[PDB]
Amino acid sequence: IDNAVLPEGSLVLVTGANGFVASHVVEQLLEHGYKVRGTARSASKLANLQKRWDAKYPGRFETAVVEDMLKQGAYDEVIKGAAGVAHIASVVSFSNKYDEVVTPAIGGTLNALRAAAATPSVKRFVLTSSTVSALIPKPNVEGIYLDEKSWNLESIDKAKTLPKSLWVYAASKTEAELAAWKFMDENKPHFTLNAVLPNYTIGTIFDPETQSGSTSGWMMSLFNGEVSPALALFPPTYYVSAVDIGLLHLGCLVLPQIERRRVYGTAGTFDWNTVLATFRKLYPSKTFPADFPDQGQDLSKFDTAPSLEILKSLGRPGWRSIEESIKDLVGSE
């Protein structure tokens, strides 16, 4: 990578490396010559992914165990020697008290930032956030533009008032990311922070046994013919390729021109009927559900300027298409 701020072969700590999105961040780091120390709550969580990375990138991936993200000193061992940190682990609480969800969300974010601030070798920190820190999609509503100053302030109220799950998740992601930027502003540490905000990530599932509770796992369920009533809870939104998400994290870790940015992972709009149409083109002889009721379309637009700058600097023309992203997940013919 031209002008990479982390020298080739540098070590990057990736927390929560067994997650679906996180595993694509790992893969792109390893693909570009970096060493990765990937954490999980137990070594068994990473066993299958470790075997893949041991074959594909021998000697470049190391499993690490961080059982408790919230513990003081949780990262004291695994941060050592790291030049970059991709913080993809999070504590997701299902408590019916708002503070019991938002407190560990913020705490897990700050715990990693504090460890990085205490480690002089860390030059770059990338936080995995979500487009829900900007908005929950509003189908068929015009005039919505999201830029790097857009925040889901609406979600905090709804999470405290509604007698839902999506709004509570949105509020916790919003508060966690705000706490990260506030940490940088209060403490002015020696490293630079960027955040990647994926929308609906579509790509290859490297380990289906453990990664099927993910955006791509739910899509794979539909490919196999299942029609959960829960599909109606997903509004029309933007997709993004899993490879592209990995590249966006890589660019946030190594590209000199990307500093203090919120990088939207928002390639194009889609709904479940777009997915079904793509399935039918990829597998014309496979049986798929007929179209779902119309849910409207996402008419919002995101400022993807830093995202496209990253992709171009990394040798990509632009976003991977939804057809290619879904093919990465399900194959073709």
DSSP-assigned states of every residue in 12-45: EEEETTTSHHHHHHHHHHHHTT-EEEEEESSGGG
Domain range for 86: 11-204+239-267+302-321
- Measure the CA–CA gap between 83 and 36, rounded to whole angstroms: 10
In this structure, is residue 59 part of a structural domain?
A: yes
Q: What is the phi-psi region of residue 197: left when phi exceeds 0, alpha when psi lies from -120 to 50, beta otherwise?
A: beta
Q: Around Cβ 110, how many Cβ atoms within 10 Å?
A: 17
The resolution of the experimental structure, rounded to one decimal in Å, is 1.4
Give, in order, the Cα–Cα distances in Å from 172 to each of 109, 123, 197, 242, 243. 11, 26, 14, 23, 26
Beta strands 237-241 and 268-270 are antiparallel
Instruction: Tell me whether residue 133 is in a domain.
Output: yes
Diameter over CA atoms, the chain: 58
In a domain, 134, yes or no: yes
Q: Tell me how the structure was determined.
A: X-ray
Phi, psi of 167 (to 5 degrees): -70, -40
Q: Which two tokens stand for residue 204?
A: 């290859």
Question: Residue 126 is inside which H or E element, if any?
Answer: strand 124-128
Asked if the structure places residue 277 within a domain, the reply is no
| 12 neighbors 83 (Cβ within 8 angstroms) | yes
Helix or strand holding residue 62 (H, E): strand 61-65
- Residue ranges for the binding site? 169
Q: Considering the domain boundaries, does residue 4 fall inside one?
A: no
Question: How far is Cα of residue 187 from the mean position of the Cα atoms in its chain?
Answer: 25
Whole-angstrom CA distances from 249 to 14, 84, 134, 139 are 10, 11, 18, 28
Q: Of 314, 322, 207, whose CA–CA distance to 269 is shortest? A: 322
Please report, for the domain that includes residue 198, its CATH number: 3.40.50.720
The total of other beta-carbon atoms located within 10 Å of residue 322's CB is: 22
State which H helix or E strand residue 153 sits in.
helix 153-161
DSSP per position, 163-216: --HHHHHHHHHHHHHHHHHHHHHHH--SSEEEEEEE-EEE---S-HHHH-SSHH
Residue ranges for the known binding site for NADP(+) are: 169
Tell me whether strands 301-302 and 145-146 are parallel, antiparallel or unpaired. parallel
Q: Do 241 and 325 touch, CB atoms closer than 8 A? A: yes
User: Which residues does 155 contact at the CB level (< 8 Å), separation at least 6?
Assistant: 132, 136, 167, 170, 171, 174
Distance, CA of 193 to CA of 254 (rounded, Å): 11
The answer to whether residue 221 sits within a structural domain is: no
- Domain total for the chain? 1
